[PDB]
Amino acid sequence: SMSVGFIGAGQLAFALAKGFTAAGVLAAHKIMASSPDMDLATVSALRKMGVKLTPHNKETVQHSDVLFLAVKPHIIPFILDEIGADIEDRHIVVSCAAGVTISSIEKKLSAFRPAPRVIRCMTNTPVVVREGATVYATGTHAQVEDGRLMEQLLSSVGFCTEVEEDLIDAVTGLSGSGPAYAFTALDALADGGVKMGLPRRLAVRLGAQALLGAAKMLLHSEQHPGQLKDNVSSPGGATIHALHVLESGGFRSLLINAVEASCIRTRELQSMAD
Amino acid sequence: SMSVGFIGAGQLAFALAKGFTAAGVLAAHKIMASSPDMDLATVSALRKMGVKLTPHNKETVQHSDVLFLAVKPHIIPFILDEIGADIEDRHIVVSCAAGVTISSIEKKLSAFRPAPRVIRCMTNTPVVVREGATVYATGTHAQVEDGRLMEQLLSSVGFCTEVEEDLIDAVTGLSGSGPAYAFTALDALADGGVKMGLPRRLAVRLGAQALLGAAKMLLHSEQHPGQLKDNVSSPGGATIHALHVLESGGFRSLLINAVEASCIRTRELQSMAD
Amino acid sequence: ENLYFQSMSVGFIGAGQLAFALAKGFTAAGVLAAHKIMASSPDMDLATVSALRKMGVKLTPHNKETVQHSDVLFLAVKPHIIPFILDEIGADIEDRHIVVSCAAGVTISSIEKKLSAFRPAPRVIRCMTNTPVVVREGATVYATGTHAQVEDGRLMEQLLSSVGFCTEVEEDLIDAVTGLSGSGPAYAFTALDALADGGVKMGLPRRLAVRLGAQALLGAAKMLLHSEQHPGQLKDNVSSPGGATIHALHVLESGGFRSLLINAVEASCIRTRELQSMAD
Amino acid sequence: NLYFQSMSVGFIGAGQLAFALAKGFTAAGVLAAHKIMASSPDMDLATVSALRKMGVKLTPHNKETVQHSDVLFLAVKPHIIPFILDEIGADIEDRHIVVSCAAGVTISSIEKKLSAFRPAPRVIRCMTNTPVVVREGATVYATGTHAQVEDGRLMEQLLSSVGFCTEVEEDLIDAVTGLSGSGPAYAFTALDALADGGVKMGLPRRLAVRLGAQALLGAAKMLLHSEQHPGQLKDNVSSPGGATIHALHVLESGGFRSLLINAVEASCIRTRELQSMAD
Amino acid sequence: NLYFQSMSVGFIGAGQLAFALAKGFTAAGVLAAHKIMASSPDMDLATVSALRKMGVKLTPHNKETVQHSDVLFLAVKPHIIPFILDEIGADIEDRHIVVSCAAGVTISSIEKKLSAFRPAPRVIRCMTNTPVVVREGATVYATGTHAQVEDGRLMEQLLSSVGFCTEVEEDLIDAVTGLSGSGPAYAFTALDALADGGVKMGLPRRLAVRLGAQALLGAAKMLLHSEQHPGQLKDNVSSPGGATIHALHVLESGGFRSLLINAVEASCIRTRELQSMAD
Numbered sequence A, B: 001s002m003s004v005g006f007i008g009a010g011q012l013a014f015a016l017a018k019g020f021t022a023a024g025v026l027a028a029h030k031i032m033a034s035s036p037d038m039d040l041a042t043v044s045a046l047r048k049m050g051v052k053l054t055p056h057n058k059e060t061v062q063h064s065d066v067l068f069l070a071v072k073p074h075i076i077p078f079i080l081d082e083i084g085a086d087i088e089d090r091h092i093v094v095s096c097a098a099g100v101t102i103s104s105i106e107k108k109l110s111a112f113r114p115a116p117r118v119i120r121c122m123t124n125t126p127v128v129v130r131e132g133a134t135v136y137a138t139g140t141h142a143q144v145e146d147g148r149l150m151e152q153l154l155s156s157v158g159f160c161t162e163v164e165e166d167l168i169d170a171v172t173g174l175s176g177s178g179p180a181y182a183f184t185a186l187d188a189l190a191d192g193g194v195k196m197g198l199p200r201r202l203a204v205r206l207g208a209q210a211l212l213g214a215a216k217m218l219l220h221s222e223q224h225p226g227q228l229k230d231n232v233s234s235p236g237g238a239t240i241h242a243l244h245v246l247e248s249g250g251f252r253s254l255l256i257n258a259v260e261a262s263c264i265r266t267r268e269l270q271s272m273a274d
Numbered sequence C: 001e002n003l004y005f006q007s008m009s010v011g012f013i014g015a016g017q018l019a020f021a022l023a024k025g026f027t028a029a030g031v032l033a034a035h036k037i038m039a040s041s042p043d044m045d046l047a048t049v050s051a052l053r054k055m056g057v058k059l060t061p062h063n064k065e066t067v068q069h070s071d072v073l074f075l076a077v078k079p080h081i082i083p084f085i086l087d088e089i090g091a092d093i094e095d096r097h098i099v100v101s102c103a104a105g106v107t108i109s110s111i112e113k114k115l116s117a118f119r120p121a122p123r124v125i126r127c128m129t130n131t132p133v134v135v136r137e138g139a140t141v142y143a144t145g146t147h148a149q150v151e152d153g154r155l156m157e158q159l160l161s162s163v164g165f166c167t168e169v170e171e172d173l174i175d176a177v178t179g180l181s182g183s184g185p186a187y188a189f190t191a192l193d194a195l196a197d198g199g200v201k202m203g204l205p206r207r208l209a210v211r212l213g214a215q216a217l218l219g220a221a222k223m224l225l226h227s228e229q230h231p232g233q234l235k236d237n238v239s240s241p242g243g244a245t246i247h248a249l250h251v252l253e254s255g256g257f258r259s260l261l262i263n264a265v266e267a268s269c270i271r272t273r274e275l276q277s278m279a280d
Numbered sequence D, E: 001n002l003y004f005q006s007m008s009v010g011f012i013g014a015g016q017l018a019f020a021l022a023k024g025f026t027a028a029g030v031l032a033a034h035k036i037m038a039s040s041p042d043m044d045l046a047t048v049s050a051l052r053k054m055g056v057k058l059t060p061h062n063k064e065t066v067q068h069s070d071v072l073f074l075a076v077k078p079h080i081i082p083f084i085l086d087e088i089g090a091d092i093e094d095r096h097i098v099v100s101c102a103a104g105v106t107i108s109s110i111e112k113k114l115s116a117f118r119p120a121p122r123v124i125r126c127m128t129n130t131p132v133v134v135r136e137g138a139t140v141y142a143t144g145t146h147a148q149v150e151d152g153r154l155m156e157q158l159l160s161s162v163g164f165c166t167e168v169e170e171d172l173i174d175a176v177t178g179l180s181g182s183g184p185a186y187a188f189t190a191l192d193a194l195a196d197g198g199v200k201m202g203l204p205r206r207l208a209v210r211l212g213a214q215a216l217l218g219a220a221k222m223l224l225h226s227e228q229h230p231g232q233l234k235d236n237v238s239s240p241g242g243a244t245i246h247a248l249h250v251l252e253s254g255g256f257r258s259l260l261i262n263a264v265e266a267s268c269i270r271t272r273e274l275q276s277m278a279d
């Protein structure tokens, strides 16, 4: 019974739209999206799925109750300055642009109507398989039900919890960038499998199934990841030999470095927005 | 309508038993397990689940149609030399000991009855959440239906495919050791999340959800993991900055090193069995 | 208590660091009188011999005298000296003796073959211990030999439990145990010297920096021994988000700190196997 | 045989430090659990859940803690401090000793905030660690401008009951944080790694954890009880050509010492930043 | 304007190399697709599926390929070779030229296996790469004991139609494998990394891949067409103080050159091992 709109019809808009429609919380036709390049693969794919597509952001705003902002962070202040006169009391504006603060969206839109309902959101592509990791912060004028509607909607395509907005730059470095860390990891493990004699197809399937299963084990365990590592590593065995070589390369510090660098870049993108 | 037995009641026996019973392919009472330390956490846990527990490996052999060998590779030739007179025509002997070849099991058991039906198996702990990665090779006397019964049984707790036996040492390095690589990875990402300001609980949940989701994306995509990495990495963005720092530490080579080292150790354990 | 009234006579062949540590520990525990202990060395000019002499331990340059005095006979010499000792005193081992080898890596099998040429059932126990027995906080393991009676392992556990932790292991674990708890205190002394340098770099007086670093190590170890929790779970509990600790942990990770300790256990274990393999 | 029959203790914050100190104080018998009260904003914390079992009084209102307490521990994150002081600052009284455990938060900043309500607040800055839960903590404290002489002596008496405790100049606390405050986390990492080492060479995990922890425990005790340099204790274990000296070489080859120096330095520098990026 | 009107080609193996060469040969117009036949044990291979679309004749029986072919490419893994030769060795005839593309497999080993059936088998060893699919392959070949002079000339003519091709002594083929045989994979890695570089600095991914590939393409063409040392071409781009020379410094600081040397060396040494661990 809700109308959803996407400004930007790229990778994130499609993932969210595909996830929502797959989840059954939203029918594809209750979704409208608009993009600048009106002939992109994501925009055509939305058409086959049943999403209404348009090149006019104003038409998208006019149709939606909940309006997702799915554009690069530097496009954001132009979208708000271009569509701000079109926001109404009914609108919930959900920003997904990396680093863009609730403050700037609220300051830009307040020039038009004084109590914009803004929610900042950080999600990732696996919403397309309904296994996303999502956090959101509610803005100054976001009503109580607004956070609940947001939590209800995004929980249908993965994990979702509210955070203080000052955690979102860090969450970006962990679960926002996370899937790319996993994709790099899977390509390399596949190279390893292939070096040791496995066909590439089998190596990719096995490496992925292992991560999927391991992550699920942690999610279902009350136990520390180190204790699971302990549980798996038989004395003198193959696994403990492999863990040693990871440690010798500082494997842990590399992933720590990555979360930090992604978080810090997100702060740089936010600080260059002001 | 099948009777299953486990020799060894440790981590792998429990994971498989818990997975099978959770999957509904096997009732807990159609499973019997035996262990040396008859007062271990895994042995007590099997009791609460409904698995029959015993300290006599002979009683386990007498009850089972399918008999899982879930012991360390050096215990294997003593188990076979101790229980070999008890194998019958009905028995399917499924070895899970790392590195132990079908040849040695067939040579040890042939001293008792001449056509032992042996299947070598490589699996991992996530069968406990029915997301295991399993491969198996059928032995000299394994009938046609034997591979099918094996594939049917282990597919119910995760992925399962037949391989040539000479791939299993490599598969061990990839999906056998895989979950421990993931557990180390999740602990470090959690350290990273925590360094950048996230609560530890939230960082573990987000890091795990990200891996679960990313792995599922790869499993459901026809696309190369590099193309998914490309799809996720917006120009100038946080993710591409994080991927750079991974590359600078040779992140890929570390995971390649790990699969290789686990595979090579598995060959060493097999070569020390002979 | 029962070992005191057991009125045991102990001998050490070799009067080096380990003999002194165990003698110091035993006497500190009250299980043994210092004069009911006899030790022997070919060089009477070590400080360890002076400390034993000052303690009241009986000292002699003749190993046979140490064998004749002993009920429990500790072999505390470098792994290559072992077969020359066994050849020299092997005729003197008696049925009453419990022979406890403390040499790194030297197998029970090798000791039994040497001694079986003299008496058919030598009672042999192999031991791996460490210097903190001197403050009764040692880490000790032992494996019982072919002819060790059940009471021999029980007496051994009681004697060594009085100076720290003690448990029986299968013998094929002792090499790994050497690399972990036998060499362990040296890793810790190195770590404490360095943490103290860290303190001094950041402005602490040296005495204070040494004191605090050791107390922290002691307290963390004690927390682990008393906790049912994984050491990583303890790590999380102290590491507040954005905090000082998590920043310090990061730079540890960036140097491969974990892999250095793994390398250390491994190299010590491998060297131990080499020391016996060079006794072939 | 020490016991503070007329002292009331309160904790602002019901996290890790509050629980460790309360468990330590009660373990020592110096304080009854019912004479201790704690407060938290998340009454669904694992530590706050645990505090209920020991018998410590729990409340969600910091004012209730301040009102029931003589000695008030501030066990909150350093950024929470200036909001906490604003909430209860009007409730501080002459009897109160305010003991800050927040990393980096200076005596000056607490005194300036509290002086706005009543002049001469009695403030003591403290740096402690989690092993107070097993009464082997390392604690230092610096006394504020208005803390009487009996104020530090009482705190030393209380904190000596859960481990080592000494007074230091306040400008040592940032470095002490990097050494003994963060110290236990370096040790937990070390014990995990050593146990991985043991497991690689064939030890059961349980045994490897036990032996590694016992070795660290024992060596630390040897150092505390010896008058000798840690290098001299190092020498005693390192028999010529032996197993230990080979392992020491590979530690040296990786710069093991410098890693531990880097860690203390990094924890102290972060502590300075948290203080300076507050003020 | 070249065309082998009386030649029949067969592939044992329907994998990557079979498909690349067949696509290349047909792209050049030198061979009609229906005059080409391939065989595979997995008739559900992506490449074997692709071969059907081009019109190449497909069969699961290696004997059928041998019987229909004049020139027979062995496009199988080096361990499959001695079992393949055992299956069709009795089917080799005087008209046959057997061209091995298996890495490391020596002319000697193929000739010894095939001489057991008919003496004087005509054998040519070949090392090629996947860019033959765009007619820019690098191919070398060594002729066997019984290959007539016209045998190598015919092969050079055929393989020159899909890229560079020259005859070498057989003991160069292991190194050529490490240079040009593995060469394209190093380049694909390089282009992925360069595109990551472009994307980091703000380029769209599509554009970064296009520009990176074009730069590699163009530089390679410059080298092939220039009489000058690659260092001299390097100098021409590196204006004093400029952007390029700063980037060259960071390549040097990571030992970029030595990595590419390590790679050729490692691929050649593995190739030697695969040959020696067969025989």
Ligand SMILES: O=C(O)[C@@H]1CS[C@@]2(c3ccccc3)CCC(=O)N12
Residues within 6 Å of the ligand: C017, C018, C021, C102, C103, C104, C129, C130, C131, C178, C182, C183, D236, D237, D238, D239, D242, D243, D244, D245
């Ligand atoms: O010397 C060594 O490297 C190792 C490490 S522990 C042990 C030792 C214990 C106590 C004091 C001195 C040495 C037992 C004998 C031996 O070889 N050890």
Ligand SMILES: O=C(O)[C@@H]1CS[C@@]2(c3ccccc3)CCC(=O)N12
Residues within 6 Å of the ligand: E236, E237, E238, E239, E242, E243, E244, E245
């Ligand atoms: O000099 C350089 O590092 C860069 C790299 S490309 C360009 C160049 C193109 C062709 C020949 C020489 C230089 C354009 C001018 C300039 O500055 N360039």
